[PDB]
């Protein structure tokens, strides 16, 4: 099953905001691949101020590095990934949504699909792809 | 001088009639004064807070279908996408 995860990672080091997002992406991707999964795409959304001063545990966050991960995997390890995300202090907010594959095997992320690129083949364009 | 609302501006290259230089034309014009209407899926716009924010009030209240003018299908998808954006930490 294709699952789109949208994580809101906290920024604590003002000099290298991307480090914590890198560590989180590494962890989630490692879990997905080591539990018979596939990581179709990692779209690096930028740094954005949160709509409100959202609170996780005791720390209060005003901005976050947003990031997206499209990955094909099973339901059980998907729930495991969600559980790990929820208890992790690094992830302010997390959300996993199914992307249906009933009709087309390959589908892009919500962002590219909204732009107009239905599939990842269109994302990487089509030359010598008729082989 | 003449307040702008009290003056009618004929655009360039447009035909006109003598009625156009009249207050009646201004009143008639006053009387008869995007992507989601283009066949797109609003649910796909759930991680896009700006385009969703186009369809809410200053306080964040979803606008009625009378205001948005969307179809019932796309109106429902827009409401669902806006609520999902609210839930996931965006918007």
């Amino acid at each position: 099953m294709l699952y789109e995860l949208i994580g809101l990672v906290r920024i604590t080091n003002s000099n290298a905001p991307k480090l914590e997002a890198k560590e989180l992406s590494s962890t989630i991707g490692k879990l997905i691949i080591q539990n018979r999964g596939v990581v179709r795409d990692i779209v690096p959304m930028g740094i954005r101020y949160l709509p409100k001063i959202m609170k996780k545990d005791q720390e209060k966050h005003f901005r976050a590095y947003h990031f997206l991960m499209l990955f094909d995997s099973s339901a059980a390890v998907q729930s495991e990934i969600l559980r790990t995300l929820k208890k992790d202090p690094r992830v302010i907010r997390s959300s996993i949504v199914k992307v249906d594959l009933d009709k087309q095997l390959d589908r892009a992320s919500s962002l590219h699909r909204s732009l107009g690129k239905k599939s990842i083949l269109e994302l990487v364009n089509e030359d010598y792809q008729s082989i | 001088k003449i307040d702008q609302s009290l003056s009618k501006k004929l655009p360039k290259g447009t035909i006109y009639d003598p009625f156009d230089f009249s207050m009646g034309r201004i009143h008639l014009d006053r009387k008869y004064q995007d992507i989601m209407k283009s066949g797109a899926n609003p649910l796909e716009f759930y991680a896009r807070p700006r385009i969703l924010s186009r369809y809410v009030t200053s306080t964040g209240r979803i606008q009625h279908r009378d205001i948005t003018g969307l179809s019932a299908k796309n109106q429902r998808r827009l409401s669902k996408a806006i609520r999902r954006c609210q839930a996931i930490g965006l918007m």
Binding site: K22, P44, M45 | -
Partner: peptide, 22 residues
């Protein structure tokens, strides 16, 4: 794993074009 490290480094460590809405 190698492809994961490569892509992660590309997207984050490298200053690639990011999908940030203007």
């Amino acid at each position: 794993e190698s492809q994961l490290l490569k892509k992660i480094d590309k997207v984050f460590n490298d200053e690639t074009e990011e999908f940030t809405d203007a």
